[PDB]
Design a protein around this motif. Structure first.
Motif, PDB file in Angstrom:
ATOM      1  N   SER A  42     -54.940  71.116 -28.393  1.00  0.00           N
ATOM      2  CA  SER A  42     -53.677  70.669 -27.850  1.00  0.00           C
ATOM      3  C   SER A  42     -52.455  71.134 -28.660  1.00  0.00           C
ATOM      4  N   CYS A  43     -51.461  71.610 -27.936  1.00  0.00           N
ATOM      5  CA  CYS A  43     -50.312  72.329 -28.466  1.00  0.00           C
ATOM      6  C   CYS A  43     -48.996  71.697 -28.017  1.00  0.00           C
ATOM      7  N   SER A  44     -47.959  71.635 -28.845  1.00  0.00           N
ATOM      8  CA  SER A  44     -46.649  71.259 -28.284  1.00  0.00           C
ATOM      9  C   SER A  44     -46.009  72.426 -27.539  1.00  0.00           C
ATOM     10  N   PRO A  45     -45.244  72.117 -26.493  1.00  0.00           N
ATOM     11  CA  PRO A  45     -44.437  73.093 -25.793  1.00  0.00           C
ATOM     12  C   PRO A  45     -43.393  73.703 -26.720  1.00  0.00           C
ATOM     13  N   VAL A  46     -43.255  75.018 -26.645  1.00  0.00           N
ATOM     14  CA  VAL A  46     -42.344  75.798 -27.463  1.00  0.00           C
ATOM     15  C   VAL A  46     -41.532  76.684 -26.515  1.00  0.00           C
ATOM     16  N   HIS A  47     -40.209  76.638 -26.561  1.00  0.00           N
ATOM     17  CA  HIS A  47     -39.453  77.661 -25.816  1.00  0.00           C
ATOM     18  C   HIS A  47     -39.849  79.030 -26.343  1.00  0.00           C
ATOM     19  N   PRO A  48     -39.926  80.039 -25.489  1.00  0.00           N
ATOM     20  CA  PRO A  48     -40.333  81.386 -25.849  1.00  0.00           C
ATOM     21  C   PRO A  48     -39.550  82.045 -26.975  1.00  0.00           C
ATOM     22  N   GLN A  49     -38.232  81.812 -27.020  1.00  0.00           N
ATOM     23  CA  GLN A  49     -37.437  82.249 -28.161  1.00  0.00           C
ATOM     24  C   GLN A  49     -37.903  81.605 -29.459  1.00  0.00           C
ATOM     25  N   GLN A  50     -38.131  80.283 -29.418  1.00  0.00           N
ATOM     26  CA  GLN A  50     -38.524  79.560 -30.620  1.00  0.00           C
ATOM     27  C   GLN A  50     -39.912  79.987 -31.075  1.00  0.00           C
ATOM     28  N   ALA A  51     -40.836  80.284 -30.176  1.00  0.00           N
ATOM     29  CA  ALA A  51     -42.081  80.939 -30.588  1.00  0.00           C
ATOM     30  C   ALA A  51     -41.813  82.317 -31.183  1.00  0.00           C
ATOM     31  N   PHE A  52     -40.978  83.141 -30.578  1.00  0.00           N
ATOM     32  CA  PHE A  52     -40.643  84.464 -31.139  1.00  0.00           C
ATOM     33  C   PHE A  52     -40.155  84.341 -32.570  1.00  0.00           C
ATOM     34  N   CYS A  53     -39.185  83.438 -32.787  1.00  0.00           N
ATOM     35  CA  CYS A  53     -38.547  83.290 -34.098  1.00  0.00           C
ATOM     36  C   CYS A  53     -39.479  82.688 -35.130  1.00  0.00           C
ATOM     37  N   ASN A  54     -40.336  81.725 -34.763  1.00  0.00           N
ATOM     38  CA  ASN A  54     -41.279  81.172 -35.716  1.00  0.00           C
ATOM     39  C   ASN A  54     -42.422  82.115 -36.067  1.00  0.00           C
ATOM     40  N   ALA A  55     -42.834  83.003 -35.176  1.00  0.00           N
ATOM     41  CA  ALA A  55     -44.002  83.847 -35.463  1.00  0.00           C
ATOM     42  C   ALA A  55     -43.699  84.858 -36.559  1.00  0.00           C
ATOM     43  N   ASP A  56     -44.723  85.220 -37.339  1.00  0.00           N
ATOM     44  CA  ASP A  56     -44.554  86.323 -38.288  1.00  0.00           C
ATOM     45  C   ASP A  56     -44.365  87.651 -37.567  1.00  0.00           C
ATOM     46  N   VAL A  57     -45.151  87.866 -36.510  1.00  0.00           N
ATOM     47  CA  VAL A  57     -45.179  89.180 -35.881  1.00  0.00           C
ATOM     48  C   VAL A  57     -45.374  89.031 -34.387  1.00  0.00           C
ATOM     49  N   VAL A  58     -44.683  89.880 -33.626  1.00  0.00           N
ATOM     50  CA  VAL A  58     -44.635  89.789 -32.170  1.00  0.00           C
ATOM     51  C   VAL A  58     -44.804  91.211 -31.641  1.00  0.00           C
ATOM     52  N   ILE A  59     -45.810  91.466 -30.825  1.00  0.00           N
ATOM     53  CA  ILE A  59     -46.166  92.786 -30.354  1.00  0.00           C
ATOM     54  C   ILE A  59     -46.528  92.717 -28.864  1.00  0.00           C
ATOM     55  N   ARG A  60     -46.414  93.836 -28.175  1.00  0.00           N
ATOM     56  CA  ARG A  60     -47.073  94.044 -26.888  1.00  0.00           C
ATOM     57  C   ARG A  60     -48.347  94.845 -27.115  1.00  0.00           C
ATOM     58  N   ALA A  61     -49.480  94.411 -26.570  1.00  0.00           N
ATOM     59  CA  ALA A  61     -50.763  94.930 -27.004  1.00  0.00           C
ATOM     60  C   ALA A  61     -51.849  94.861 -25.950  1.00  0.00           C
ATOM     61  N   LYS A  62     -52.842  95.750 -26.087  1.00  0.00           N
ATOM     62  CA  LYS A  62     -54.059  95.579 -25.295  1.00  0.00           C
ATOM     63  C   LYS A  62     -55.270  95.622 -26.229  1.00  0.00           C
ATOM     64  N   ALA A  63     -56.281  94.883 -25.806  1.00  0.00           N
ATOM     65  CA  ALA A  63     -57.477  94.720 -26.629  1.00  0.00           C
ATOM     66  C   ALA A  63     -58.490  95.759 -26.143  1.00  0.00           C
ATOM     67  N   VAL A  64     -59.056  96.492 -27.072  1.00  0.00           N
ATOM     68  CA  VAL A  64     -59.890  97.662 -26.848  1.00  0.00           C
ATOM     69  C   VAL A  64     -61.366  97.356 -27.081  1.00  0.00           C
ATOM     70  N   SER A  65     -61.652  96.588 -28.140  1.00  0.00           N
ATOM     71  CA  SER A  65     -62.987  96.070 -28.355  1.00  0.00           C
ATOM     72  C   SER A  65     -62.978  94.753 -29.138  1.00  0.00           C
ATOM     73  N   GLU A  66     -64.155  94.137 -29.120  1.00  0.00           N
ATOM     74  CA  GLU A  66     -64.360  92.836 -29.702  1.00  0.00           C
ATOM     75  C   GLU A  66     -65.648  92.721 -30.518  1.00  0.00           C
ATOM     76  N   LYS A  67     -65.575  92.211 -31.746  1.00  0.00           N
ATOM     77  CA  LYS A  67     -66.802  91.749 -32.393  1.00  0.00           C
ATOM     78  C   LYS A  67     -66.553  90.510 -33.249  1.00  0.00           C
ATOM     79  N   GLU A  68     -67.631  89.804 -33.549  1.00  0.00           N
ATOM     80  CA  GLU A  68     -67.586  88.635 -34.411  1.00  0.00           C
ATOM     81  C   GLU A  68     -67.710  89.117 -35.851  1.00  0.00           C
ATOM     82  N   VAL A  69     -66.822  88.641 -36.718  1.00  0.00           N
ATOM     83  CA  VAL A  69     -66.865  89.027 -38.119  1.00  0.00           C
ATOM     84  C   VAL A  69     -66.889  87.787 -39.028  1.00  0.00           C
TER      85      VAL A  69
END
Length: 182
Positions: free
Chosen positions: A2-29
């Motif tokens: 469970s998460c509190s609602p965050v305006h999208p700007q406020q998530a942008f500003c709080n995050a360390d890093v913000v990217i547009r991305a696609k996932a290419v592969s997956e493994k458990e590490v």
């Protein structure tokens, strides 16, 4: 999870890093041991960074997340397909870590102004605080606060302000909602 609602700007500003991305592969590490000496299991998504909007200048190549949504792990649709706007924790070294309370939405579901505002405008309000108004009547203490009304006027947390407004800091130290000029 469970998460509190965050305006999208406020998530942008709080995050360390913000990217547009696609996932290419997956493994458990194995990601190291916790404080008790117990291994920490993560999903490692290998990604293609399409664009970095903010963060350290070294490109993200891997995104990590819990195995299960039961403890807030994130699912990315791997296989070069879905693109996501992803905001999260920077670990350094082209690695990030995300949880379901981070801002993670399919790229094509963003409003035009959300997308555009990723490039310079949201950054103009990262000294501001966006405060949710749970219910009329509400108020703000500090001048650098914008009051997020979407909940109390629309019943939706992705309402008018979330889609079209950013909270921008003015000369005076005060902040205010603006709809993106022109």
């Amino acid at each position: 999870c469970s998460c509190s609602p965050v305006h999208p700007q406020q998530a942008f500003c709080n995050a360390d890093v913000v990217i547009r991305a696609k996932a290419v592969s997956e493994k458990e590490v194995d990601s190291g041991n916790d404080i008790y000496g117990n291994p920490i299991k993560r999903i490692q998504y290998e990604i293609k960074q399409i664009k970095m909007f903010k963060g350290p200048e070294k490109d993200i190549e891997f995104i990590y997340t819990a195995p299960s949504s039961a403890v807030c792990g994130v699912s990315l649709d791997v296989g070069g397909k879905k693109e996501y706007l992803i905001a999260g924790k920077a670990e350094g070294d082209g690695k990030m870590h995300i949880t379901l309370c981070d801002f993670i939405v399919p790229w094509d579901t963003l409003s035009t102004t959300q997308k555009k505002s990723l490039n310079h405008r949201y950054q103009m309000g990262c000294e501001c605080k966006i405060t949710r108004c749970p219910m009329i009547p509400c108020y703000i203490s500090s001048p650098d606060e914008c009051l997020w009304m979407d909940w109390v006027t629309e019943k939706n947390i992705n309402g008018h302000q979330a889609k079209f407004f950013a909270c921008i800091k003015r000369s005076d130290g005060s902040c205010a909602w603006y709809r993106g000029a022109a």
